[PDB]
Design a protein around this nucleic acid. Structure first.
Lengths: 159, 99, 104, 50, 99, 56
RNA sequence: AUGCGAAAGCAGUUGAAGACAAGUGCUUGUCGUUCGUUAAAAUGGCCU
């Protein structure tokens, strides 16, 4: 409704619709509510991110949560979250940007030291190594963007 | 105005209107009519400064002796010139690097 | 165009004679794909910049400088992205060593 | 050294001593970049281990 | 310390301190947070009487003040809102957007 | 320090105020990691000049 | 170099009139001149 989109444009949205309207919204109104809603709970937002809908909502939700929330809170909520979808998510990242890299940093922080598979970690180190390399070449290129004695000279002239 | 208050010395543009030598310096007495002189800044300045900038040719401060013998001009390039008003001639004082 | 040394050679020939238009298409291609794995086209831009900067400054004023500012924006975003990527590489190295310690 | 390289590139080509000095400088700056890369890595390790 | 890593920069912050030294009102853009000084974290009510630790105000905060340990004044980018703290509800409002 | 943080990490994640314990380590790595980008810039310009005088 | 903006950046900007000098009625430069726009020089450096 136009009134609902006007209230999504409106700054204050009191408590309960911010608590549970994401399940009701689960397209256009979805994108509007995610680009603007003043209060958005972490459990529902991380579940929406870890859904595999992938409308560049990766970028959208990641920028939203990194704008509005703290690293310790994201770490604790993703500690509470499930491991299998985390594995599928990091598989999605290594298959196919600073928002998602900070997301990768935070999921590493939440997973800690215990649940690391072998070949998954091998592919992750390979991907991160080649992307560090291309980022280093990119940085050097950007800095490059930001960057007498006539002892005897036999000549001839045209008169 | 000279430090007594008996002389004033000012500049004019009517010789810009009537000459290529542009600004005219004129010094006038106040309570008597003893001294009154007028001459162009083309005669005041040097000749080697005409291939140079308006910073040099921009006069920025005037000072007069209490007798009227010396008139000190100070340009925007930082070089003072003191003219003796008998033979109407210059001596240069060069220290300031700004105006 | 394949070998970097023959790229230096053909670059010297381009500067002998075209450099503006190839710089423009290289600029548009890189500002489209900043993360292109093919390093050869960045070697093109790198050698062209370390050889012929002055004429790049003195040729034009608008239809080079606009895309130059846009590519500056993209590559400065890459310079922003680098350090947390280095830190993530460090954490992965730590986890690899811990896995090694669990093995042996 | 940013402003020295900005000034003196021509005499850098002309005289060979400064060329060897630039070789030593290149090696040491690359070595320093390596040092700071490893230090950033260890700081990332600490931020994991918080 | 209390150092969160926010990817958004806002030029307009403010903060205020209760007289006892316990309650700290950190007003960042759009949002006031209430913190205990002992923890530097959100003062979470065990009673939960709708004295919510975060306030969200319609405009960007230019000023937070507490005139006593009761009344909190906020001057926001368009308006001005006076709130009580013994009951978590805004008392008074004033429009300053033309001014 | 690499192998130490590898091995003994359990007690390190168990102790609460890791900053106040490992203060000087955090500060030293902070200085060096903050030093890095100007070094990258200086190496970029230095390599440009070196390849310029080496190409001919 | 103006506005918005975060210490990033994002948009936009360099128009005429008049007068004078020099060179050759024509070219450049200049302004202690107007209106319209959101708009390096005179060898000369710090007291006791």
């Amino acid at each position: 409704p136009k009134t609902l989109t006007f209230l999504l444009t409106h700054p204050l949205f009191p408590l309960s619709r911010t608590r549970n309207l994401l399940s009701l919204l689960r397209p256009r109104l979805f994108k509007q509510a995610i680009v603007t809603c003043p209060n958005l709970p972490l459990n529902e937002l991380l579940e929406e991110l870890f859904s595999i809908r992938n409308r560049e909502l990766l970028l959208d939700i990641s920028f939203r949560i990194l704008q509005d929330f703290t690293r310790d809170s994201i770490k604790q909520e993703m500690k509470k979250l499930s491991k299998l979808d985390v594995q599928n998510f990091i598989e999605f990242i290594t298959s196919g940007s600073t928002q998602l890299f900070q997301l990768l940093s935070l999921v590493l922080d939440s997973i800690g030291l215990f649940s690391l598979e072998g070949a998954l970690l091998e592919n992750l180190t390979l991907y991160i190594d080649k992307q560090v390399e291309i980022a280093e070449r990119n940085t050097e290129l950007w800095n490059l963007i930001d960057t007498a004695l006539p002892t005897y000279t036999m000549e001839y002239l045209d008169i | 105005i000279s430090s007594n208050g008996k002389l004033l010395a000012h500049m004019c543009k009517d010789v810009s209107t009537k000459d290529h030598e542009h600004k005219s310096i004129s010094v006038v007495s106040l309570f008597d009519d003893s001294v009154n002189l007028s001459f162009p800044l083309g005669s005041i300045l040097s000749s080697q400064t005409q291939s140079l900038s308006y910073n040099t040719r921009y006069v920025s401060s005037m000072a007069i002796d209490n007798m009227g013998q010396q008139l000190a001009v100070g340009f925007a390039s930082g070089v003072i010139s003191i003219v003796s008003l008998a033979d109407l001639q210059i001596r240069l004082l060069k220290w300031h690097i700004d105006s | 165009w394949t070998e970097p040394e023959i790229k230096k050679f053909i670059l010297t020939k381009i500067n002998t004679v075209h450099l503006s238009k190839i710089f423009l298409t290289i600029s548009k291609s890189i500002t489209q794909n900043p993360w292109n794995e093919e390093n050869l086209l960045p070697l093109w831009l790198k050698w062209l910049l370390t050889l012929k900067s002055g004429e790049l400054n003195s040729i034009k004023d608008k239809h080079t400088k606009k895309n130059c500012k846009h590519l500056k924006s993209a590559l400065r975003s890459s310079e922003e992205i680098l350090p947390v990527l280095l830190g993530i590489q460090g954490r992965l190295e730590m986890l690899r060593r811990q896995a090694k310690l669990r093995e042996d | 050294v940013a402003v020295v390289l900005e000034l003196y590139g021509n005499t850098l080509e002309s005289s060979p001593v400064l060329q060897e000095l630039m070789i030593d400088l290149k090696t040491k700056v690359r070595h320093e970049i390596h040092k700071s890369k490893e230090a950033q890595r260890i700081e990332g390790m600490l931020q994991l281990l918080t | 310390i209390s150092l969160p890593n926010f990817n958004h920069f806002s030029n307009s912050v403010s903060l205020a301190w209760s007289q006892d030294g316990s309650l700290i009102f950190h007003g960042f853009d759009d949002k006031l947070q209430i913190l205990d000084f002992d923890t530097f974290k959100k003062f979470e009510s065990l009673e939960n009487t709708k004295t919510v630790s975060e306030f969200t105000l319609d405009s960007e905060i230019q000023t937070v003040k507490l005139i006593n340990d009761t009344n909190l004044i906020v001057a926001t980018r368009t308006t001005l809102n006076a709130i009580n703290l013994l009951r978590g509800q805004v008392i008074n409002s004033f429009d300053l957007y033309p001014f | 320090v690499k192998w130490c943080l590898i091995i003994h990490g359990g007690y390190l994640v168990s102790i609460p105020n890791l900053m106040s314990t490992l203060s000087s380590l955090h500060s030293t790595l902070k200085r060096r990691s903050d030093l890095l980008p100007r070094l990258l810039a200086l190496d970029a310009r230095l390599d440009c000049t070196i390849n310029k005088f080496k190409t001919l």
